[PDB]
Structures are given as structure tokens and as C-alpha cells.
Chain A
Amino acid sequence: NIANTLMAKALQECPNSGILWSEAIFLEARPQRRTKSVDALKKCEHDPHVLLAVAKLFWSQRKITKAREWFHRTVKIDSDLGDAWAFFYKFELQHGTEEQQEEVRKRCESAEPRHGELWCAVSKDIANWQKKIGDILRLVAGRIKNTF
């Protein structure tokens, strides 16, 4: 309940926050997520976190085609942001086809036009920053010291 009060205060004082709004969806109960939260949330902003949250909600309702379409829209609207590639691959593994999962994984290749900062997106969203995270990455000297 105190977490809900804090989230409501944060939304009131810091609107247009894609990550905060998406995580507020996860605070809200399932009967109250799609009915009221997601609509006003989409009205507020169209962040890649917004589209990722909509796709995740559809996947949680097992709306496979709707979730896939929203994931495609998320990919088109922004790349290497929000670490949505991991969620898309998980959805493909658990709901999509094996060939579809392989195609999704291949499209997540680290390249300047698409998924250039995929590791950076994972660090920013899935909290992949670590002392050995930079060492695992190619940029041992720079990334390890810049990141936590």
C-alpha cells in the first residue's frame, strides 16, 4: 500500500515518465490494468516502455497476435531502448514459433541502425550493470569504469 502511495505521488509529480508508468501498470491489479491504467498511459505518452508494457500485458492475457503486433510496433518506434528484445525473445520462445524466435533473435543483432545499444538497453532496464559486466563486454577499459 505504501508502494502504491509512493507510485501515485511519483506519477502526480513526475508525469510523462514511461518507465514509471509501465511499472505502475505492474503495481495495478489485473482487473484494473487494461481497463483504466493502460488507456490513460497511452494517452500520456508513447514511450517504447509504453508499447513494451502493452505487449507484455497482452502476452499475460495470451493475446498472441496482438502482442506480436505491439512488439513489432515497439521495435519500429525505438531500437536498443528499454531492453524489449529480451521480452520479445521470451514471448517467442514461450508463445511464438521456433523459426519466429530465431528470426526475432537475429533481428536483435548489435548494429548501428538496430539494437546498437542492446547491452546498454539491458543495463538501463534489466539492471545489467556490474563490475564484471564491462569486462564481459568488449570495451573493458571504458565501459567497466563508466558503468557500475
Chain B
Amino acid sequence: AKLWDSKMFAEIMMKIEEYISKQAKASEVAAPEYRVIVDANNLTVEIENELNIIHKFIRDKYSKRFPELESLVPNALDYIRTVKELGNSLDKCKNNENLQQILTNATIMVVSVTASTTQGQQLSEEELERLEEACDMALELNASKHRIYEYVESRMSFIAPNLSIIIGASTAAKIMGVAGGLTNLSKMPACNIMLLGAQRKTLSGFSSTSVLPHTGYIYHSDIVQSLPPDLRRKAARLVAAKCTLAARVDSFHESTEGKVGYELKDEIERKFDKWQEPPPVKQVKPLPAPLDGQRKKRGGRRYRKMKERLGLTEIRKQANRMSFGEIEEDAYQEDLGFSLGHLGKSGSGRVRQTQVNEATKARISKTLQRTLQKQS
């Protein structure tokens, strides 16, 4: 089946290319190291794709057992670990100590609630063994990915010196692995690198801001996480841009000592200092003195419009006229202090009803109109 073919291909790749990477790692513990680095940084994408295939097959099989955990658990590796720790046993959902280390407490509650009253039937033995071998192979490939990322972190000093200087070596290895290579990452736009490894975390009733979406491995790097949250997202963008530059240098093997790395990290630190700088001293405006005499104010179309807007209207003029002697019943239960006066009252001197002056219509501001048009 698909699982068997994917597992066979993964084993064939690991017996040759992963073995070559292992020998290269053990050598430092004419076949230059560059080809080993490149084949490892392509192996990461190969194993990611085969793990995606494995995750799809596991989803297809487990939909019979639990057709809801896909939406509840978006991460593929987290899905595989969850089904490994669950299997056909859904009554195990209560107080799983092993589920804590994989899933956050917010979503363990949701998966337990869903499994309480789910319609998924229990799988048979053949499905159980198929799923178990699939999960075992998936976790083995995940371990292989972890080992190869450790190898790339070790080789960070050689593959991308400047980019390893800018950010953490682990972050650099992860971003090159997810991007597909040093060349593959260097060809990507700066606005895309910061989106690398941005898992679609599902909101568990919380707001989207709690999820922190559009956040990548750069957002979780060492330097970015050392900033106040209100200054985090912006910081990430900056770092991403500079990271891109490093790749666009490192992919062409320039400043192998890292001179561009320092020339970018110092300006990153400068930008961070400027953003975090204490606010300047701002004098307070003394209250203006009371006015006397006359100040000449112009008239014209604007003055006419403002006078029409703020002028007394006929219905408003009739509102504040209260009839002497003739008592009126208060038509506003919620407040006795409000009355229409002559408006609607007998003896008001108006046989017809006082019309509405549309010059006093309530309308939104210009900036509110702009925002509404944007939100449309």
C-alpha cells in the first residue's frame, strides 16, 4: 500500500544517504563535505514529504476510529504522536500523563470532550497493526530528522556562517531544512522566510491573537524572544529581512569569517535599542489664558455650513418649549426628566407635524469612512 511503499523508499534513502551523513558526522568525531551537506538538506525535504504521506495515510485510517482529531490536532507530527498514544483506546483520554507532553492542556480537554461522544467505530486488529507500524515508522523518521538537524547545527559554522551569526544555529538549521536548502532559502522573499514553520495552530475558542498566527521559526528565535510582546512581530520582520540578506550572501560563499554577519547583527541591535529607547522629555503645554476683547473670525461657505450644523432646528426649537399649566403625562418610564415639550403637545401652534431638519443628520467621520471601505 501507500504506507508500505513510503516506508520502503524511506528505508532505501536512509540506508544510503543517511548512512553517508552518519559517516561524514563520525569522520570529524575527493568527496568534499559540501555534497554531504547538500544531500542532507535535501533529505530533510524528502523525509518531510514522506512524513506528510504517512500522516495522510494515518489520517485516512484513523478517520474510521476518530474522524475529528484532524481538525482538533493540526500538526502532522503531533497527530502521529496523538494517535500513537490513543490508538483504538479512546477511554484512555482521561488524565493521560503522556498526552500532556505532546498536546497543550487547552486541546487535550477538547479532544477528550470530542472522544466522549464521537461516532467513530473501533478499528479491527489489521487496522490497529497497520496504524501502529505507520506510527512507528513516522516516529523513526522524525528521529532521523532530529539527528540530521543536529548535524546541520554542527555544520552551521561552515554552511552559512553569516546567517548562523545573525540568529541561533538551531533556528538556522531548522529554517534551511524547511526551506529546502541554502540556495532554496536564499531565493525566497524576506516576507516569506519569517513564515517558515508556521503551524496552523487551531484556536480553542480563544482569540486569533492568543494563537499568535503568521509566526515562524524566526519569531521563536533567541533574539526575537528577548523583546516585549508588543515589539515582537515587528522585530521578527526585521530579523527575517536581515536573515534573507545573510542567505543571499551565504549562498554565494562571501564573508566566510562572518563580517557581513557582524555588519548586520550590529544594526539589528541598533534597531532594537532604538525601538526600546526611553521616551524623550516632552514639555507640557500650559493652559491658555482666558480670552477677552474680540478676535476676527471669517465667514463664508464653511461658516454657513457649520452654522447650519450647530444651529437651532425647528423641531429642537419646539422641543424646549414647555406648555404652562397644562400638565403632560411622562411618556418615558426610564427617565422622568425627559420631555418633548410642545413637540407633539396640544397648543404648540403647529397644525402639521414639524419635519426633520436633515442638515442635522448623523454621519461618520472621514477616517471612519476610510476604515469601513477598507473593511469591505
Chain A residues closer than 8 Å to B52, beta-carbon distance: 30
Q: Which of A112-141 contact B (CB under 8 A)?
A: none
**Secondary structure of the B side of the interface?**
helix
Q: Which of A49-72 contact B (CB under 8 A)?
A: 60, 62
Interface size grouping (class) on chain B: under 10
CB-nearest residue of chain A to B52: A30
Indicate whether B180 reaches chain A with its CB closer than 8 angstroms: yes
Cα A69 to Cα B59 in complex, Å, equals 21
Q: B180 touching A29 by the CB < 8 A rule?
A: yes
Total inter-chain residue pairs, C-beta < 8 Å: 10
Q: B60 touching A62 by the CB < 8 A rule?
A: yes
Q: B180 touching A62 by the CB < 8 A rule?
A: no
Indicate whether B89 reaches chain A with its CB closer than 8 angstroms: no
Cα A31 to Cα B70 in complex, Å, equals 19
Indicate whether A94 reaches chain B with its CB closer than 8 angstroms: yes
Indicate whether B130 reaches chain A with its CB closer than 8 angstroms: no
Write the A29-56 contact mask toward B (1 if CB under 8 angstroms, else 0). 1100000000000000000000000000
Cα A30 to Cα B52 in complex, Å, equals 10
Cα A11 to Cα B268 in complex, Å, equals 41
Write the B201-212 contact mask toward A (1 if CB under 8 angstroms, else 0). 000000000000
Q: A62 touching B49 by the CB < 8 A rule?
A: no
Cα A30 to Cα B56 in complex, Å, equals 14
Chain B residues closer than 8 Å to A94, beta-carbon distance: 60
CB-nearest residue of chain A to B48: A30
Cα A62 to Cα B59 in complex, Å, equals 9
Indicate whether A95 reaches chain B with its CB closer than 8 angstroms: yes
Write the B37-56 contact mask toward A (1 if CB under 8 angstroms, else 0). 00000000000010010001
Chain A residues closer than 8 Å to B59, beta-carbon distance: 62
Q: B60 touching A30 by the CB < 8 A rule?
A: no
Cα A48 to Cα B49 in complex, Å, equals 28
Interface size grouping (class) on chain A: under 10
Cα A60 to Cα B59 in complex, Å, equals 12
Cα A53 to Cα B56 in complex, Å, equals 19
Q: Which of B58-73 contact A (CB under 8 A)?
A: 59-60, 70
Cα A103 to Cα B206 in complex, Å, equals 41
Closest chain B CB from A30 CB (angstroms)? 7
Closest chain B CB from A18 CB (angstroms)? 26
Chain B residues closer than 8 Å to A30, beta-carbon distance: 49, 52
Q: B60 touching A95 by the CB < 8 A rule?
A: yes
Chain A residues closer than 8 Å to B70, beta-carbon distance: 62
Chain A residues closer than 8 Å to B180, beta-carbon distance: 29
Cα A62 to Cα B180 in complex, Å, equals 23
Q: Which of A68-85 contact B (CB under 8 A)?
A: none
Cα A94 to Cα B1 in complex, Å, equals 12
Closest chain B CB from A37 CB (angstroms)? 14
Cα A11 to Cα B278 in complex, Å, equals 54
Chain B residues closer than 8 Å to A62, beta-carbon distance: 56, 59-60, 70
Chain B residues closer than 8 Å to A29, beta-carbon distance: 180
Chain A residues closer than 8 Å to B60, beta-carbon distance: 62, 94-95
Chain B residues closer than 8 Å to A60, beta-carbon distance: 56
Cα A62 to Cα B70 in complex, Å, equals 10
Write the B114-155 contact mask toward A (1 if CB under 8 angstroms, else 0). 000000000000000000000000000000000000000000
CB-nearest residue of chain A to B180: A29
Cα A94 to Cα B49 in complex, Å, equals 19
Cα A30 to Cα B49 in complex, Å, equals 9
Chain B residues closer than 8 Å to A95, beta-carbon distance: 60
Closest chain B CB from A127 CB (angstroms)? 23
Chain A residues closer than 8 Å to B56, beta-carbon distance: 60, 62
Closest chain B CB from A51 CB (angstroms)? 22
Cα A105 to Cα B98 in complex, Å, equals 45
CB-nearest residue of chain A to B59: A62
Write the A13-24 contact mask toward B (1 if CB under 8 angstroms, else 0). 000000000000
CB-nearest residue of chain B to A59: B56
Cα A60 to Cα B57 in complex, Å, equals 11
CB-nearest residue of chain A to B53: A60
Besides A30-B52, A62-B59, 8 new A-B residue pairs in contact (Cβ under 8 A), listed by A number: A29-B180, A30-B49, A60-B56, A62-B56, A62-B60, A62-B70, A94-B60, A95-B60
Could you name 10 residue pairs across A and B whose Cβ atoms are closer than 8 Å? A29-B180, A30-B49, A30-B52, A60-B56, A62-B56, A62-B59, A62-B60, A62-B70, A94-B60, A95-B60
Going nearest first, the 8 A-B pairs with the smallest beta carbon separation are A62-B56, A62-B59, A94-B60, A95-B60, A62-B60, A30-B49, A30-B52, A29-B180
